[model samples]
Target: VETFAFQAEIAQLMSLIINTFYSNKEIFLRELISNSSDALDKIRYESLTDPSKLDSGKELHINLIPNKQDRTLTIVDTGIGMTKADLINNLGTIAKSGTKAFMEALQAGADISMIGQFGVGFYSAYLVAEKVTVITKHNDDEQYAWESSAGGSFTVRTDTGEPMGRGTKVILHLKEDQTEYLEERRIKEIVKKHSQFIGYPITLFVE
Candidate 1:
């Protein structure tokens, strides 16, 4: 398993958000779904000029699967999934210059297609999940898995399982107190409230 440590600042930011921001832990779902929609938008935009870029016959959509048996919630999407370098750059560090520039452009009324400028929203999973796992495949890179337990470090390794054509799947191992998220009604309510306007279809499945 390949491993990398979070930047000191990134670690501190995570703690601040997970521990201090307890009022609405379920917003993590909204944030994650929004990020997935953004990813789909990116791939869709790229495929405008090159139709081959779109996942062949795969509609751009988000899947929310809540498994009570496994005590996991999985969010998967057909989108512009991350490369190994992208995961390292996106998750391993905060305060990235490029992201900062993007945020500045956003504030100046630039295109809002790009999201997660601050690069901390994904960590919100830690609020409800004891462990988070991301499986992704990019057109330019091989499939891989990145996992962490909200500790100081995360691991990345080649995913030996079935390959996803091009997208990401985030599996959240729910925490004991966060079990409410496994309920279909609760998840749908939160999605409708926070992400009803999202560009793509947001589906929920429970088992």
Candidate 2:
């Protein structure tokens, strides 16, 4: 329901990550999967105290769906979905209260690799996706969609479609040159090499 602009430093960091720093764009998948794993772990931990925190019938896993005709690659996970506030704090800003501290550290020439230490992995999707749409549902909140084109701002609104139960789905509109990511074999190879040890099962679909 609210819209905000990215901090100058956040925008700069995105540009660096997408173009200058990360040469291997495939790392986007790895980062996204790693994030999903963390979300799953969070839900699992909470479910230990409250079984209803997570869906009992649903298994925790990651799904990768590539559509060549649509030029979209969708990565989904049955994990802890975020609320509207979480989406704003996590995606809209670099850090909730530590933005000034992070900016100070960056001005002091902090190591670029430490960016993910503050939770910037989600932005990696911008490396290959012209637009990214995240549809998520949290047990505590209604289903919502957060969308952005890696521009200065993003939009979040309630999802009118069916809910995902409790999870997150990220749909990436691939860049023209990034179409190779749509190949099942390519995704399998990347998963095998970079994400084989993930705690959750990774399934790739190309139909």
Candidate 3:
């Protein structure tokens, strides 16, 4: 069995996210926030049934980290993270959302404002990033990193990064042409316009 698959790449070759689906490339940020928001929502539901899910006790929030020296823009969420199988099934396959079942089960008369379903929104990271890296730690599994440039296939490997606890960290290494996204004001401006009322608190670590 191969370590990874190509439905994600196969679709990217079809102009999935790297290509300009939206005239305004900035929409990518909102898609990612929507994704983080949903991830946090899942953890909330899980903790309801199994309180240990929140044993780490870190308050859940969406963090925007901009590293100007490395030219990377990161979005970190203290949410229910993904396991290796999740990396393969959810990300390896295009438009396949691993949380669909979980989301549906919890949405039974749940808040209508929950970002309904965003199957392919993860790929939107490619819109402004030359390369994308996801380091996630699920309470039920060890940490893993799923990384890819817009290429044939992505790698799912055990990463040594500090996970802290249950959550996900998405690092977007910005394209040379998309460096503006690394600016704090630009990111905050975009977030305000798209996700100001989102349930989770969105904070940017600007230095």
Model 2 scores a TM of: 0.87
Ranking by lDDT: 2, 1, 3
Summed backbone clashes in each candidate are: 0, 0, 0
lDDT of 1 at 200: 92
Cα lDDT computed for each candidate against the true fold:
0.81, 0.81, 0.75
Off by over 4 Å in 1: 55-57, 95-119
* Residue 150 lDDT (model 3): 59
Give stretches of model 3 more than 4 Å off. 1-3, 8-10, 20-22, 95-118
Candidate 1 lDDT by residue in tens digits, 11-37: 665565456535568878987997799
Worst 10 residues of 1 by lDDT: 110-119
Error in Å for residue 123 of model 1: 1.3
Off by over 4 Å in 2: 96-118
